Design a protein around this ligand. Structure first.
Ligand SMILES: [K+]
Ligand SMILES: [K+]
Ligand SMILES: [Mg+2]
Ligand SMILES: [Mg+2]
Ligand SMILES: [Mg+2]
Ligand SMILES: [Mg+2]
Ligand SMILES: [Mg+2]
Ligand SMILES: [Mg+2]
Ligand SMILES: [Mg+2]
Ligand SMILES: [Mg+2]
Ligand SMILES: [Mg+2]
Ligand SMILES: [Mg+2]
Ligand SMILES: [Zn+2]
Lengths: 92, 96, 153, 159, 174
RNA sequence: UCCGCUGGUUCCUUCCGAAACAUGUCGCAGCAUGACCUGACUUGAGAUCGUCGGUGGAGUAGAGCACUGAUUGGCGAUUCCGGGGAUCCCUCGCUCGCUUGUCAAACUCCAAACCCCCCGUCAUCCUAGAAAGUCGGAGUCCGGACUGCUGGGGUAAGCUUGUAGUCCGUAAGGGAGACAACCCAGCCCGUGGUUAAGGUCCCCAAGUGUCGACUAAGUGUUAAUACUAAAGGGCGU
RNA sequence: UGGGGCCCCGAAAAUUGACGGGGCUCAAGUCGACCACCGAUACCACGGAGUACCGCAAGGUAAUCUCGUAGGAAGGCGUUG
RNA sequence: CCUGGGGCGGGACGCCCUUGAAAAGAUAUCAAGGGCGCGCAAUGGUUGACUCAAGCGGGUCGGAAACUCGCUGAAGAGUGCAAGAGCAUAAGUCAGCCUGACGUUAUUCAGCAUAGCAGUGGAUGACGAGACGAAAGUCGGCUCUAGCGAACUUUUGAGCCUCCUUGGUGGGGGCCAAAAAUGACAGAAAAGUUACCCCGGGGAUAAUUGAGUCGUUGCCGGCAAGAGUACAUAUCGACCCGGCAGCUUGCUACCUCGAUGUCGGUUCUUUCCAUCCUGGCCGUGCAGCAGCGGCCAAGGGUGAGGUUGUUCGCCUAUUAAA
RNA sequence: GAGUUUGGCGGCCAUAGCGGUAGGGCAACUCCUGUACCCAUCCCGAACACAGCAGAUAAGCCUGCCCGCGUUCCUUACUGUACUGAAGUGUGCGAGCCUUCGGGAACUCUGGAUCGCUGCCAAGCUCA
């Protein structure tokens, strides 16, 4: 499915309808200084690690298209609950 | 297997007679009920908005308020008192 | 005036028919009540037609039932002296005739019980597995309720 | 497979063939016998069943064959008119494991008939009334119900 | 064309082709009196109609025939007559006490500068509150009757007599 | 040790008295929450197990073919789409109608009886406390049966799985030979009386009862019944 | 010829056995009706016990109180100190 | 885990529609028909303008296959995809303008009747901004009901709060929302084998006997289609229809799992009759001999051997019959 | 002030629909006449829109009638039939069915009716 790259919608911050650009959200790398990373390193020893020796699960048949809507005026983005599509493109 | 949707077993409940299919009489959509009035719930299948559950079809509710276009009814369901919201298209005054 | 006498007991009866019996004050067999002829009581009696015998009662039968089985609070037996003290009628026959004519009420006897607990029928009844129209005792006896009421005195 | 299996009516109808799969075709070929373009037959006798039963298409075909043979032999090829009034609409099924998933497969069709319902009607001349009566008696021997013959038209023409 | 028991015949007003029940439903949900403006080929007519379970009730009514007593001799079936009838309807409704409504043109096409919108402008200019957008109104000159310049010299008197009828109609409700 | 699995768990009377069901659960021999039982308190005026009438919901039974599909011939036409041995020289299956014959869980032009909500009414209960609320204690989530629903499935089953009522479970006593649940009957103790169901030839209390017929087979002498043989035939009567 | 009642044929099982048994034939069977009687702890009457609620008490009311498994609630008996 | 034992098969293990379901509601099964784990910046919103399917007639190798005209046509079309429901001056088709397929938030329904239970989903509102439109209105996607997921964790968005005496930096912790999945779908990170097996229980649940049933099995009957050089019925007995027995195999799960000792044979006793012989009969397509068919009859008899554990069956030679 | 004709908006939504037949317009409506204009055609002033002197009741509309199909209501027969609530020591080998009291069709048939009824307003008119 296609969505326009730019369309006019509501900005929650400026509280008006402005043009907004849609940007796909990329998942970031997990920090090594978060409390869960420190806990994993602390629970690392001899033997089973508990939840830190779990193997990651499966995947749903289609993931949601993680989109972020940045207002062109205030340059602030907001993200809304998103649809679930096999193939996603931007309408240009 | 068998589902648990709202429209469960609604083939004839939410069906219209042959010569009442189409646009319903519009007078039923602009009727006003007073507080405490007894109204029947006779769902109009063509009006797909503001329709109470088909479980309350055939029940008489008491008007207890208004929530915009819709009316708030106190409708008895078994031994409980349920608050049912209905557009006047699905409602009908009781006649004494 | 209906005469309603219960002839079948309470085991294996639907709760709706049994509750109708209780609203007629017929909790036990051989118990009799007298109710007016309005459609409410008519439908109630039609509801319990398979457990009672009913019909129109005459003044003589009402007089005998009042004298032999009328009771007051504390289980006292109705008498003529109490009737003359608490009613404008001299005797019980005149009171029963007034009640049948509708110009008096059994509630016009102070402390009188609305239930008449009758004796079992002498020489038996026609049977509680058939209706009156089938040769049994159940159901509508019409004016012939007085025969059964006479044999239950 | 005896007719006593699918004989009693204990169930609802099973006739909507778009919700089922694979019904064997009926054995009964014709439903009108004799002279089909004649209506001025004065005597008209019919065979009525007297119990509520299901008649399989093979039983209907057997009864039709025997009655038609008797009529053609006695009254001639066009001395009678014979009508099989009922069509086998019910689908018979059988469970062919045990009682698990026991909903059966379709094995045939049957006609669900009511008491006093006409099965066969025969129209003949006055002189062939007893022959038609005899033929319908033989037809009823092939059916899973007790039957009786009744005269519908021309009762005064026989006695 | 009732073919049989399963045939559905429309409502009588729909069979006659005189009402749109979808539009009527949309207009009744206002719970406001409808300003019903209808026009025939020879004159224009305005009504104030409120709904009842027994049928519509009319509160006020102005027709083009009423203008002729105020000093109008032009055609009753053009823009000047429609505007004047709208003005009279609005003034009369204000006299009665009713002062609000919504425009009900029914099946009539919505065209800028139409007679319906001239009647609407006449209603607006009398103080009778009714929602609208000014871009659908006719130009003031053609409400005065500048189309008289088309073929007819006798029609050339329409502006001054339109002004005279307007002032008299104001005076009647002044 | 632990176990959701097995066995046991000790005095009396009195008041009340279930559930063998739903949802979730590595849940299915368990548990939680709720329904249902029990105790107490608060509150303070109604409630509805039943009737009758009325305003409403009906889409089941039955019925019917008007829709969706099936289904049987006859008759009339599609100079149309096509089966048979150069002017497609002429033969004709389906298709569409008017009559005939049949149907439907998942068809409906129709359409009950039950039933459900609400209003009034009578009736019953209720200030010796309605409806409502709060809190304490649970058991229970192996059920079974009869009578209906042609309940569904099944060749059927004292089969399996539903539903309404009522029972056994937990129900004595009376009666059916005996009989968990079939009939009378719900039962504090004692005495007297009269009945119920059922019975009255003896066993065995009460009829070798009455009237009118039938049966010749010891047929039968068997309400319900898991405890009772059919189609077919008989110038038996 | 048709419609009916009862009976007969159709009708074969394993220890000796089942209308409950004896037996029964214008019946002691079946059908249609009827009469009288017997027969419960039901119902009625009397007397008694308990219970619920009310009542300062005395006592009053109970046709609408008296079966009961799981189980809740109340009051008592007993053992040793 | 469910399961007409278990296992194999399957998923009735999450969601949605029709029937079952008995005209309120509820209602089970490895009940029946099934479907869904999506697709779509248009296949969405609004306004305007139109009306669909299919027939009939007219129109040039534009064929009874195109496109166009007229008539009929409440829908026999279309509306993305199951089923059911809804819709015609439209909820359909085309076109103009658009992005409401909007941020925040409250209730009540229904999943989960009555009657507690979650993530959710769906109706009605509020706040704030808009699109279309004269306005009324409509729009919280695609007519309504499927297309989905807790806690913890990470990452992302906006602005804030906070980190142990105080201020600052780097790095952490938190609040609200979005994304990533647990389909055994109210969420364990999870392969077998045991006949070497053990323990606790269960007739709550199977192998076996018993009970029920009788599809199947064995044995019959009704009607007689016909065959029988003719002749249904000496003999055979089609199609369909109705049974009996419980001696085959199934079905079922009522009894028994704190054990009712398996198959076959042997020994000994007994019963049934649907009779193989022996006795008595009837028919014959019965000359006699001997058959074939049937009826009565259960007193007596019904044996010996080869193979095979066999039951059963085959074979051998006797025999009144074996 | 009562009624009528016409017009507008409606209610119930076929008793109103489909079809046939005969009458009317003085006002009103309408068909109808044009396209300077506002507004319009995926082309077309056909529509919509505007401006309208004539012609016309042939249409729409109105009034009368017709039972022809459709619908709705009544009537007679079917029939108190089908079905069904309650109860039953009534009954069947069985699938089942019956009796009593209470409810009660559908279809078809005989004969009729039904070719809308109706609310608000306005305007022409017909008055004592
Ligand atoms: K049809
Ligand atoms: K099994
Ligand atoms: Mg437990
Ligand atoms: Mg039916
Ligand atoms: Mg019982
Ligand atoms: Mg127990
Ligand atoms: Mg009990
Ligand atoms: Mg007992
Ligand atoms: Mg106890
Ligand atoms: Mg398992
Ligand atoms: Mg080894
Ligand atoms: Mg062990
Ligand atoms: Zn912004």
């Amino acid at each position: 499915m296609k969505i326009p790259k730019r369309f006019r919608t509501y900005c929650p911050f400026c509280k008006t309808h402005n043009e907004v650009v849609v940007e796909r959200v990329k998942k970031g790398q997990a920090s090594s200084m978060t409390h869960i990373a420190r806990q994993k390193k602390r629970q690392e020893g001899i033997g089973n690690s508990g939840k830190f020796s779990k193997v990651p699960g499966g995947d749903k048949p289609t993931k949601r298209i993680w989109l972020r809507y940045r207002c062109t005026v205030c340059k602030k983005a907001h993200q809304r609950p998103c649809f679930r599509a096999k193939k996603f493109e931007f309408k240009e | 297997t068998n589902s648990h949707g709202e429209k469960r077993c609604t083939r004839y409940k939410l069906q219209k007679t042959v010569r009442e299919r189409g646009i319903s009489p519009v007078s039923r959509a602009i009727q006003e009920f007073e507080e405490g009035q007894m109204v029947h719930i006779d769902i109009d299948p063509s009006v797909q908005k503001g329709m109470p559950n088909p479980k309350f079809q055939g029940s008489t509710g008491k008007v207890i308020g208004q929530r915009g276009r819709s009316y708030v009814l106190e409708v008895r369901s078994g031994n409980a008192m349920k608050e049912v919201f209905s557009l006047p298209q699905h409602l009908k005054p009781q006649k004494y | 005036m209906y005469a309603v006498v219960r002839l079948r007991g309470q085991v294996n009866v639907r709760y709706t028919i049994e509750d109708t019996m209780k609203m007629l004050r017929l909790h036990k067999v051989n118990h009799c009540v007298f109710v007016p002829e309005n459609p409410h009581y008519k439908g109630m009696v039609q509801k319990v037609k398979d457990y009672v015998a009913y019909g129109k009662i005459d003044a003589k039968t009402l007089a005998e039932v009042l004298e032999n089985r009328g009771r007051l609070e504390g289980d006292t037996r109705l008498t003529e002296e109490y009737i003359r003290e608490n009613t404008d009628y001299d005797s019980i026959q005149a009171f029963a005739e007034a009640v049948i004519e509708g110009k008096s009420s059994l509630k016009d006897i102070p402390k009188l019980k609305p239930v008449f607990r009758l004796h079992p029928p002498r020489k038996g009844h026609a049977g509680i597995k058939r209706t009156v129209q089938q040769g049994g005792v159940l159901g509508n006896h019409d004016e012939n309720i007085n025969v059964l009421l006479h044999k239950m005195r | 497979k005896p007719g006593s299996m699918y004989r009693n009516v204990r169930q609802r109808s099973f006739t909507r063939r778009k919700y089922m799969g694979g019904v064997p075709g009926s054995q009964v070929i014709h439903y009108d016998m004799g002279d089909k373009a004649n209506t001025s037959f004065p005597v008209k006798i019919s065979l009525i069943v007297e119990e509520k039963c299901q008649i399989r298409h093979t039983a209907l075909e057997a009864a039709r064959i025997t009655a038609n043979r008797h009529l053609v032999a006695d009254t001639g090829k066009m001395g009678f008119y014979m009508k099989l009034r009922v069509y086998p609409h019910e689908v018979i099924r059988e469970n062919k494991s045990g009682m698990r998933r026991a909903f059966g497969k379709n094995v045939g069709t049957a006609a669900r008939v009511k008491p006093m319902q006409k099965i066969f009607t025969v129209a003949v001349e006055k002189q062939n009334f007893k022959a038609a009566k005899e033929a319908l008696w033989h037809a009823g021997q092939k059916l899973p119900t007790p039957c009786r013959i009744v005269v519908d038209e021309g009762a005064e023409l026989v006695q | 064309m009732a073919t049989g028991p399963r045939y559905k015949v429309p409502f009588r007003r729909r069979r006659e082709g005189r009402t749109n029940y979808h539009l009527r439903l949309k207009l009744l949900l206002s719970r406001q009196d409808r300003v019903v403006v209808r026009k025939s080929s020879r004159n224009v007519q305005i009504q104030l109609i409120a709904p009842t379970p027994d049928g519509d009730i009319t509160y006020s009514s102005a027709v083009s025939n009423e203008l002729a007593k105020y000093g109008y001799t032009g055609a009753t079936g053009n823009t000047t007559a429609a505007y004047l009838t709208g003005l009279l309807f609005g003034l009369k409704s204000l006299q009665k006490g009713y002062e609000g409504g919504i425009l009900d043109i029914g099946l009539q096409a919505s065209s800028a500068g139409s007679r319906v919108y001239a009647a609407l402008k006449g209603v607006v200019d009398s103080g009778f509150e009714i929602p609208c957008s000014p871009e659908v109104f006719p130009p003031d000159e053609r409400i005065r009757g500048e189309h008289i310049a088309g073929y007819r010299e006798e029609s050339s008197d329409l502006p001054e007599q339109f002004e005279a009828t307007k002032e008299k109609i104001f005076a009647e409700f002044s």
